[PDB]
Each structure stands twice: as C-alpha cells, then as structure tokens.
RNA sequence: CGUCGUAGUCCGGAUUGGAGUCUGCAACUCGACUCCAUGAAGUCGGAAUCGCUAGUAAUCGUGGAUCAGAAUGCCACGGUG
RNA sequence: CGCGGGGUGGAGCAGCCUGGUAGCUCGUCGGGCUCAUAACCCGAAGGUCGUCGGUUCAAAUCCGGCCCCCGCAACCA
RNA sequence: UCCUCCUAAAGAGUAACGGAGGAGCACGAAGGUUGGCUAAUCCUGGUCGGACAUCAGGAGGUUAGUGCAAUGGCAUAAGCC
C-alpha cells in the first residue's frame, strides 16, 4: 500500500489548484492518459486504479506514474467543535489539472490505453481516458 | 549575569572604583587592565579583585 | 660531504650532451627530503621524549623543534597543543649531505635489500630509501645501548615520467624493484 | 597561487584607497627592477614617474635589483615630485611589504627632500 | 502545538529607496544583516555595528549597475 | 655495538644477543666471533665499529624475520588450497599435534581465563 | 670450580614446516630417535580442602615387564634424608 | 479530558540528573561443603539499555518519532 | 517580555491556541590592532598499531568555521595564526 516518506514538518497546508498546467509530453514512455479537467486525487484512488490496471495487464510493462501524493491531510474526531484544532496526519493527496498525463506507458502495446480506459476511469475522479502518442 | 560584583581599588587617589563581575569559576588569577578617569586624565591603575 | 661537488659535475647532467635538454629545468633534479619522526603512544609515557628532545637533530643538519598537534580530541588520547612529532627537514646542501649515508652505510639492519617495491613512485620515478626504524650512524657516543624510532625516506624528482626520472639510477647504484 | 596572494593584498589596499580618491603614489618592484609612479587626481592617467629603465640609472647601476638602485628611484621620484608640487599624496605598495626595497626607497626619498 | 511566537515589532525597511535630497547624510541601504551582498564603493564607506552603509558626506545615491554579477555597491553621485 | 640483538639489556656474554633469534641460528653465527676478536665466555664489550666489519661481511648466506616466515607460510599456503589433512587444519583453527580436544588442546584453543 | 637474576630468564624449545634415522604390507593418520631453523606458556595456583609419627615423609638416579617397532603408566633397586 | 513515571545480557530494578562510562541480587550451566538436593561460598556466558533516528568528541540518559505498561482519573454545557 | 527565517498582500506595522526555533546568558577572553593564513572531506604511503594516529603528495572548495538559536553573508574574509 502507498505510504509516503514522513514529512520534515509534522503537518502541511493543502493548497489551491490553478486548473491548467501543461505536462502532456511523455518522458517515461511514449503514450499516457488525457486529463482535460481539474480536482483532488487521493492515495487510495491511485492505488485502486493501479489495482484495476494490475488485474487487466497482469505483469506487462511496467507502467510509470507521474502523479504521487504531495500532502498528508490532518484528521481528528468528528465531535471536537469548531475552533481548536488540527489533528494528526491521516490520508495523503495531490492535485490534478487538464495538462496532466498522469500515467506513462511504452512497453504495453494495444492492451492498455489504446482502445478504451473505462475500467480504470471508474476508480478515478474527472472522467479520464487514454491518449495516443504524439509524433509530429 | 547572577555573578558576584567586586570593585577594583586604585593604586592611588581616585574617586571611582571599577566594578568587576569577572568569572572566578575557572580563572583564580587577578585582573589588571587600566581605565580612564576624568579627574587627573592620565589613566588609572586598578587592582585586587576576583 | 662530497656529493654536492659531483652533483654539479656530471650526475644527471652529462645527459645534456646526448639528449634534448637545453637546461637542468627539463632534466631530473633532487633537492628535498620532508623528514618526520612520530611519537605514537608517547602520551602513556610522557617522560622519555621530555629528555630526548634533540634525538632527531642527531641525524639531520638542522635545528630541532617539536611539532604541535592539529587535533584536540582523538580515539587514542590527545590534548590541545600536545607535541605530536619533529621534522628537521632537509633541502639543498643539507639534503645532499644527508644522502651520502643512504644505501652507502645504512646497512646495519635489512628487510629485503634487493629493491622491495616502488611505493610512492608518483609515476615520475620517486625512489624509496627508508629504514623503517633508525639504524645508528658513526659520529660520537654511538657504541652503547640506546633506543631507536621509526624512520622512512622517499627521494622525489622533478622528472615528468619514470622513463626519464630513471636517469638517476643510470648515474648511481642502489637496489631497485617495481 | 602565491602570486595571487600578493594581488589579494593589493585588492585590500585598492579598496581602502578608493574612498580617498585624490593624488596617489604607487610603488612596484621585481627581482631585477623597481619603479614608482604618481597617478592623477582623476585616477585615469599618470603624471610623473621614476623607473630602473632609464639609462640615467641603468648605465650607472651594476644591477637594477640592488638597494642603491631602489634609492636611485626614490631620489628621482622625490626630485620629480618637487617639480610638479605634489602634497597630500597617498602611498600604495602594490600588495608588497613595506619593509626592504620599498622602505629603502622611501628612506632616500625623505633624504632628497620633504616627507614622504 | 504552537508557541512558535516570532515575537513582535521589527522593521528596518524602505530607507535605501529612490531619489535623495542631496543635503544631509543618508543610510543608502538598511537591508538587514549585510556582510558582502552590497558593501560600499567610491568616496563613501559604512562600518556601523548594525551593518548600515551610511555615507559620511552629504550627497545623492548613484543606484549603480557596475559590480560583479549579483554584487552591487552603495555609492554616492557627483553633482 | 649490536649486530643482531634488538632488546635493551647491556654488558652480557656474546651469545644471548648474537645467536638463536629470528633466522641467524647458533651453529655458524658463533664461529665468526673469534675472527672479530670477541670471546664467548664471560660478559664482554669489545664489539664495536671495526670488529663488526668482520660480521657485516656475511651476505646472502641466510635470511631472517618476515622473509623466513614467508618461506614456511608459502610452504603451507600451497597445501591450504588442497583437500589435504593439514591443508584444512591450517585453513581452519584446528590442531595438527595429534591432540585430544576432549582433554588438551590448550595452546590451539587459548583461555582458560 | 667457572657463570648468572627478580628480566616469561644463560634458560625453555612447548608449538610449525623441511630434511632425515629405525622397525614394519604400512608410520599420511595415531610411533620413536635426530639436525639446521623458527618460537609460546610457566615468576603459587578458584570457593575450599588433603595426608602420616622415621629410614617414615621429603628428593635423584639404576633395572625389568609389554615388545617388529615407543611410555612419563605397571613392578622392583639403591643414594641424600 | 489533562498530568506524572517506568521500558537497562534471561527476571526485576540501581545507574542517569552531577558526561570521561555498562551493573547488582537472582537466573542458566559448571564447581566447593555432601551420600545427595536446598541453605551457603565460588566459576562461567550474554545486553538492538523497547526500538527508528536526531545531537555531540562522547551515552541507556540529552531529544523527536513508532510501540508497550502503570498511577491520578472523566470531579463541564 | 525579548529575538531570526516565513505567512504578511513585488509601500509599512500585522491576524487565527498560524509555520521552523530560541532568549533571562557567554567570553576579561572568545575584546582592540599590525601582518599573515585558508578550509572540510576523501584517496596514497610511512615500526612498535586492536582503531581514527605522523608528514608529504593528489583531487577539491562561497560545501570548513562562525560562544549559543534560526536566518543572511563570507578570502576586501566578519572564519583562525
């Protein structure tokens, strides 16, 4: 399961997304995904999406992932009132925007991300899909 | 800082006594440095403290 | 004290009559020995070197001086300003004066005497002539029982390669091995 | 680079002289030569100098790196200083020691006239 | 957690800025804890215990572009 | 003056610091002392410069210390490569004195604090 | 008589290779004797305790048995006491 | 809630605070006393000093984390 | 109560039980000043040497250090002789 390295500081700030940022050129492979939308992505979502692909791709590839959790989130008991204060770290998250490629592939010809992505898109936010390699 | 004050004596007639707070926790030796006083204005020799 | 006369007459210099060198600035030259004598575990004695203070100047033509440490706490015990050795460095005439006892009369103790191995050679032809421990030379009051310490000697050259630094081993004879 | 250490000592001096501006006397020496030059109050050019290159010294001195040759330049730059009336002149030693040939030059410059 | 404090009241800002009046002495730059990023050049110097490049003569600032790469000096103008 | 001894004691007979150490043996190393004018009964001090030149003359006749230990060590290291009985017993810490490790192997074992 | 100390010693030479010498299918492994060389341990010794009344304790040599080929163990002998 | 301690060859705790540095009484095995085991006197072996790191020339101690325990304890809409 | 870096908005003080930490002292020397010096770390090799040991060479450097904290700077050294 995905559990990122302990942060230098005990807690972090969540931060705002600009909802664009180009990152469409594949550099760990030759093809990937289309994002075309904006939102928040969690560690459990990218591990559940990895599970969906791991079950369909068996051991071929591997597949490289350009999204990784960036922040831990603070969580506390539900009954604590509004005011004081921030709890301990629980789940880890990242931000996604239209120019992201998310996942990068090359060693998996025609059995992943070439005809459909529906089975992995069902685990994710922003109704994602596959992309074809950019050559010109 | 929380250290003992002891004033140096002049070897001659002088209206001032220079106040020392010299640490004596590793240095038992005496302090002799010369100071200025605005009366005779030819420097004063100060002795015997801590 | 005669090497100073011969090193100026032909030793690695008559070479210049058959090889393409217009000055001694392209030929091998020897002018330095950066001597040292270590104290080792002397901090657990602290009384013998307190009286053997000129015992390195007994073999070197310069003024004795105790070297002070550059380390204040160590896993072998040291203290700030503790004396850690003695140098009594050889250059020029005192280096040629000192070299006249090396290999010629330094034979009271041996460990190979056929050339050992070319350590610290620097790719130039830097030659070993050390004795590991002092062997005692004839001067004054040298026949008695007296203690001896660690002594190692390398003769370093201005040559550019051991192909040309070896012109010294073509002017003198000493046992050599690579 | 032991040559650069002399230049560092000159950077120290050049920075220290920069707040003075004004007329400046620079002394420079080498193992065979010595010279001294007076720099203008705008810093952009020389006014007068003395150097062991002149046949007035170089034909009379048996070696130009000598003490008496440093004194010959000191006694010439002091003589040319009196010709151009220079006062409030700040001294500069080009990263060298003052002791030795720069002192032996200065000692004779204050023998040919005013201090210096 | 908490107790990170930082404390209260500190400034040392905006005094080394724009056109000067050229008739009293000026700080030139009051940037905090200066040891080599700026320094002084030309006829002026500043060696104060609070790292101020305060000029000791009356004049205006040059806002000079000379000096090696990212090291630029506090200097007074000729007028 | 000394020729083969390295220990500190002074003014002894010409055998204790002259023979039976590091490689010099005792069989030919003592016959040379009469040519140097040195007596072998009762403590003596006649070995100095001059006398010792008669002893510094002996060259290439014997070997001492690490080069004599090299001679035996290589003469066992050639066997430690092989399946020989003394090969493994010098590759591993095992006795060769025909010992009973039930009773006495004390030199090969050690303390016995 | 000569010689020597409070030093793991003049010593010791226990250990480790290389040569040999003997007996014997055979001594590699488990045998003895020898030589040139190398080289370590031992300077009273755990809680605690052992034994007899004079040629006894204490201590040094000599012999035999076993045996193709070795004992320091086994059985005996005398000197000093 | 919140507060204050403990974690030390196998067991249970001194040690720490005061820096020049790994232990005691038992335990385990083997002895000594004995016909023998206990009582009792000796001999021997083994510490991630919970444990990951930090800090320092330098610790188990300085000190953050990740766990395991106890004592006061829930004495407020 | 005091103090740094940041939040704090390319003009300034600055909020919320905001973010990383400290200060109630230290040093008569660790202060003044002249001239110098230049790390660190690692590799090489040198009896007594468990193990870091010496002096010299090579690579190499706003990377060593700065009384203490966080921060900015560093040979014109504010770092040490």
From Swiss-Prot, chain A:
The modification N-methylmethionine is found at residue 1. Keywords: Hydroxylation, Methylation, Ribonucleoprotein, Ribosomal protein, RNA-binding, rRNA-binding, tRNA-binding. PROSITE patterns: RIBOSOMAL_L16_1 (PS00586), RIBOSOMAL_L16_2 (PS00701). One of its GO terms (cellular component) is cytoplasm. It comes from the Bacteria. GO terms for biological process: cytoplasmic translation; ribosomal large subunit assembly. The modification (3R)-3-hydroxyarginine is found at residue 81. Pfam families: Ribosomal_L16. GO terms for molecular function: rRNA binding; structural constituent of ribosome; tRNA binding. The keyword Ribosomal protein applies. Is hydroxylated on Arg-81 by RoxA. The modification is nearly suppressed when E.coli is grown in anoxia. InterPro entries: Ribosomal_uL16, Ribosomal_uL16_bact-type, Ribosomal_uL16_CS, Ribosomal_uL16_dom, Ribosomal_uL16_sf. CDD domains: Ribosomal_L16_L10e (cd01433). Part of the 50S ribosomal subunit. Cross-links to the A and P site tRNAs. Interacts with assembly factor DarP(YjgA). Binds directly to 23S ribosomal RNA and is located at the A site of the peptidyltransferase center. It contacts the A and P site tRNAs. One of the last ribosomal proteins to be assembled in the 50S subunit. The simultaneous presence of uL16 and bL36 probably triggers ObgE's GTPase activity and eventual dissociation from the mature 50S ribosmal subunit. It has an essential role in subunit assembly. Belongs to the universal ribosomal protein uL16 family. HAMAP family: Ribosomal_uL16. This is Large ribosomal subunit protein uL16. It comes from Escherichia coli (strain K12).
UniProtKB/Swiss-Prot annotation, chain D:
GO terms for biological process: cytoplasmic translation. GO terms for cellular component: cytoplasm; cytosol; cytosolic large ribosomal subunit. GO terms for molecular function: 5S rRNA binding; structural constituent of ribosome. It holds the Pfam family Ribosomal_L18p. SUPFAM superfamilies: Translational machinery components (SSF53137). Disulfide bonds: none annotated. InterPro entries: Ribosomal_uL18_bac-type, Ribosomal_uL18_bac/euk. Residues 1-16 are annotated as: Required for binding of the 5S rRNA/L5/L18 complex to the 23S rRNA. The protein has been shown to contain a phosphoserine, which was required for the protein to bind to 5S rRNA. However, the presence of this phosphoserine is controversial, and it has not been seen by mass spectrometry. It comes from the Bacteria. Keywords: Phosphoprotein, Ribonucleoprotein, Ribosomal protein, RNA-binding, rRNA-binding. The basic N-terminus is not necessary for binding to 5S rRNA. It is however required for cooperative binding of L5 and L18 to 5S rRNA as well as for binding of the 5S rRNA/L5/L18 complex to the 23S rRNA. Part of the 50S ribosomal subunit; part of the 5S rRNA/L5/L18/L25 subcomplex. Contacts the 5S and 23S rRNAs. Belongs to the universal ribosomal protein uL18 family. PANTHER family: 39S RIBOSOMAL PROTEIN L18, MITOCHONDRIAL, LARGE RIBOSOMAL SUBUNIT PROTEIN UL18M. NCBIfam families: L18_bact. This is Large ribosomal subunit protein uL18. The lineage of its organism: Bacteria, Pseudomonadati, Pseudomonadota, Gammaproteobacteria, Enterobacterales.
Swiss-Prot record, chain E:
It holds the Pfam family Ribosomal_L27. It comes from the Bacteria. InterPro entries: Ribosomal_bL27, Ribosomal_bL27_CS. One of its GO terms (biological process) is cytosolic ribosome assembly. The keyword ATP-binding does not apply. The keyword Ribonucleoprotein applies. Keywords: Ribonucleoprotein, Ribosomal protein, RNA-binding, rRNA-binding, tRNA-binding. Gene3D superfamilies: 2.40.50.100. Residues 1-14 are annotated as: Disordered. GO terms for cellular component: cytoplasm; cytosolic large ribosomal subunit. GO terms for molecular function: ribosome binding; rRNA binding; structural constituent of ribosome; tRNA binding. Part of the 50S ribosomal subunit. Cross-links to the 23S rRNA. Cross-links to the A and P site tRNAs. NCBIfam families: L27. Belongs to the bacterial ribosomal protein bL27 family. PANTHER family: LARGE RIBOSOMAL SUBUNIT PROTEIN BL27M (PTHR15893:SF0), RIBOSOMAL PROTEIN L27 (PTHR15893). This is Large ribosomal subunit protein bL27. The lineage of its organism: Bacteria, Pseudomonadati, Pseudomonadota, Gammaproteobacteria, Enterobacterales.
From Swiss-Prot, chain F:
Keywords: Ribonucleoprotein, Ribosomal protein, RNA-binding, rRNA-binding, tRNA-binding. SUPFAM superfamilies: S13-like H2TH domain (SSF46946). Signal peptide: none annotated. It holds the Pfam family Ribosomal_S13. Residues 93-113 are annotated as: Disordered. GO terms for biological process: cytoplasmic translation. GO terms for cellular component: cytoplasm; cytosol; cytosolic small ribosomal subunit; small ribosomal subunit. GO terms for molecular function: rRNA binding; structural constituent of ribosome; tRNA binding. Belongs to the universal ribosomal protein uS13 family. Located at the top of the head of the 30S subunit, it contacts several helices of the 16S rRNA. Part of the 30S ribosomal subunit. Forms a loose heterodimer with protein S19. Cross-links to the P site tRNA and weakly to the A site tRNA. Forms two bridges to the 50S subunit in the 70S ribosome, contacting the 16S rRNA and proteins S19 and L5. NCBIfam families: uS13_bact. PANTHER family: 30S RIBOSOMAL PROTEIN S13/40S RIBOSOMAL PROTEIN S18, SMALL RIBOSOMAL SUBUNIT PROTEIN US13M. This is Small ribosomal subunit protein uS13. The gene is rpsM.
């Amino acid at each position: 399961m995905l559990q990122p390295k302990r942060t230098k500081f005990r807690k972090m700030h969540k931060g705002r997304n600009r909802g664009l940022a180009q990152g469409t050129d594949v550099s760990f492979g030759s093809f990937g995904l289309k994002a075309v939308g904006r939102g928040r992505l969690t560690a459990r979502q990218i591990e559940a999406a990895r599970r969906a692909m791991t079950r369909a791709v068996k051991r071929q590839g591997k597949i490289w992932i350009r999204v990784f959790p960036d922040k831990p989130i603070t969580e506390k008991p539900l009954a604590v009132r509004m005011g004081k204060g921030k709890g301990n770290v629980e789940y880890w998250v990242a931000l996604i925007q239209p120019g992201k490629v998310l996942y990068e592939m090359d060693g998996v010809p025609e059995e992943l991300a070439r005809e459909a992505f529906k089975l992995a898109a069902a685990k994710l936010p922003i109704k994602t899909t596959f992309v074809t390699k950019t050559v010109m | 800082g929380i250290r003992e004050k002891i004033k140096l004596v002049s070897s001659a007639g002088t209206g001032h006594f220079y106040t020392t707070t010299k640490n004596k926790r590793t240095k038992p030796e005496k302090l002799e440095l010369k100071k200025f006083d605005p009366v005779v204005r030819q420097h004063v020799i100060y002795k015997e403290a801590k | 004290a005669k090497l100073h006369d011969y090193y100026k007459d032909e030793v690695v210099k008559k070479l210049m009559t058959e090889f393409n060198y217009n000055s001694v600035m392209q030929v091998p030259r020897v002018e330095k020995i950066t001597l040292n004598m270590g104290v080792g575990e002397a901090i657990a004695d602290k009384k013998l070197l307190d009286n053997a203070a000129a015992d390195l100047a007994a073999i070197s033509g310069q003024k004795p001086l105790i070297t002070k440490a550059r380390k204040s706490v160590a896993g072998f015990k040291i203290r700030q300003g503790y004396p850690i050795g003695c140098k009594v460095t050889l250059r020029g005439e005192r280096m040629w004066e000192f070299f006249e006892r090396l290999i010629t009369i330094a034979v009271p103790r041996i460990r190979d005497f056929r050339g050992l191995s070319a350590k610290s050679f620097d790719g130039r032809g830097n030659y070993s002539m050390g004795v590991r421990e002092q062997i005692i030379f004839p001067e004054i009051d040298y026949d008695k029982v007296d203690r001896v310490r660690g002594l190692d000697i390398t003769i370093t050259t201005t040559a550019k390669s051991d192909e040309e630094g070896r012109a010294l081993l073509a002017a003198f004879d000493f046992p050599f091995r690579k | 680079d032991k040559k650069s250490a002399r230049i560092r000592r000159a950077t120290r001096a050049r920075r220290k002289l920069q707040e003075l501006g004004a007329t400046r006397l620079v002394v420079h020496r080498t193992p065979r030569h010595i010279y001294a030059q007076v720099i203008a109050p705008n810093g952009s050019e020389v006014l007068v100098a003395a150097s062991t290159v002149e046949k007035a010294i170089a034909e009379q001195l048996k070696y130009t790196g000598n003490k008496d040759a440093a004194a010959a330049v000191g006694k010439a730059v002091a003589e040319r200083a009196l010709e151009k009336g220079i006062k409030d002149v700040s001294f500069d030693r080009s990263g060298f020691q003052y002791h030795g040939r720069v002192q032996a030059l200065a000692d004779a410059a204050r023998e040919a006239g005013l201090q210096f | 957690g908490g107790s990170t404090r930082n404390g209260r009241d500190s400034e040392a800002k905006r005094l080394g800025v724009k056109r000067f009046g050229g008739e009293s002495v000026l700080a030139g730059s009051i940037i905090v804890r200066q040891r080599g990023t700026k320094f002084h050049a030309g006829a002026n110097v500043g060696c104060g215990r609070d790292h101020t490049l305060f000029a000791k003569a009356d004049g205006k600032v040059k806002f000079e572009v000379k000096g090696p790469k990212n090291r630029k000096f506090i200097s007074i103008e000729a007028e | 003056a000394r020729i083969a001894g390295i220990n500190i004691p002074d003014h002894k007979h010409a055998v204790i610091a002259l023979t039976s150490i590091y490689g010099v043996g005792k069989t030919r190393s003592k016959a040379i002392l009469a040519a140097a004018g040195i007596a072998e009964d009762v403590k003596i001090s006649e070995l100095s410069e001059g006398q010792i030149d008669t002893l510094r003359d002996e060259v290439a006749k014997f070997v001492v210390e690490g080069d004599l230990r090299r001679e035996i060590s290589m003469s066992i290291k050639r066997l430690m490569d092989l399946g020989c009985y003394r090969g493994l017993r010098h590759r591993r810490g095992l006795p060769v004195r025909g010992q009973r490790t039930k009773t006495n192997a004390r030199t090969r074992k050690g303390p016995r604090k």
